[PDB]
Copies of this chain bind each other. A is one copy, B any other.
Amino acid sequence: MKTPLTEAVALADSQGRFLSNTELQYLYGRLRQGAFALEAAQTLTAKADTLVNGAAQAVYSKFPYTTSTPGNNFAADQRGKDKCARDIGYYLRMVTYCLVAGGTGPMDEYLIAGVDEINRTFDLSPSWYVEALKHIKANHGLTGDAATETNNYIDYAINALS
C-alpha cells in the first residue's frame, strides 16, 4: 500500500526517529494533490458505466477474433462478456481507488501483484487490457492537472501490464 503518508511513516519508523519537516512537506504536497484528486475521482465515478461499455466495445473492435472463436477465455458467449466487462469495471474502480488514495498502492495490491501469472494461466492477452486502458485514458474527459495524473495512473497500469 504505497501511499505517501504511509511511506513517510515507514521511513520515519525504519530510521527510528520522530517526524521531521520532510514529512510535513510530504503532507502539504499530498493535501495539494487531494484537493483536486477527490473531485476528479467523483467525476470518474459519475462517468464510469459509459466508460466501461465504451472500453469493452473498443476492445471488441480492435480484437474482433475474441467475439468470434469458441473458447471460455474469449468473450464469444454472454458469460464472457459479463465477466469481461466486470474486469473492465475492476480496472476502472482501481483507478478511482488510486485517485482517492493518492498513490499507486491500491492497484499494486489489488491488480498488479498477480496479474502476470493470472494472464499466463488463463490465456488472457494483456494487450486487451492495454487497449481498454488506452480507451479510458483517451475518453475520461477530465482536464488539467487532474487529467495528467489520472493519465499517469493509467499509464502506470499499462507499463505494469506490458
For A7, A15, A30, A32, which residue has the most chain B Cβ atoms within 10 angstroms?
A7
The distance in angstroms between the C-alpha atoms of A160 and B69, with both chains bound, is 24
- Do A25 and B162 have beta carbons less than 8 Å apart? no
In this complex, how many residues of chain A approach chain B with their Cβ under 8 Å: the count is: 38
In the complex, A19→B110 CA distance in Å? 19
Closest-by-CB residue of B relative to A62 is: B69
Known: A7-B11, A30-B29, A121-B162. A21 touches B103 (CB 8 A): yes
Most B CB within 10 A of own CB, among A2, A25, A65 = A25
Q: Are B32 and A152 in contact (CB under 8 A)?
A: no
Chain B: minimal CB distance from A3 (Å): 7
Q: Does chain B have a CB within 8 A of A42?
A: no
A49 interface residue, CB < 8 Å from B?
A: no
Chain A stretch 1-58: residues in CB contact (< 8 A) with chain B: 2-4, 7, 11, 15, 18, 20-22, 24-30, 32-33
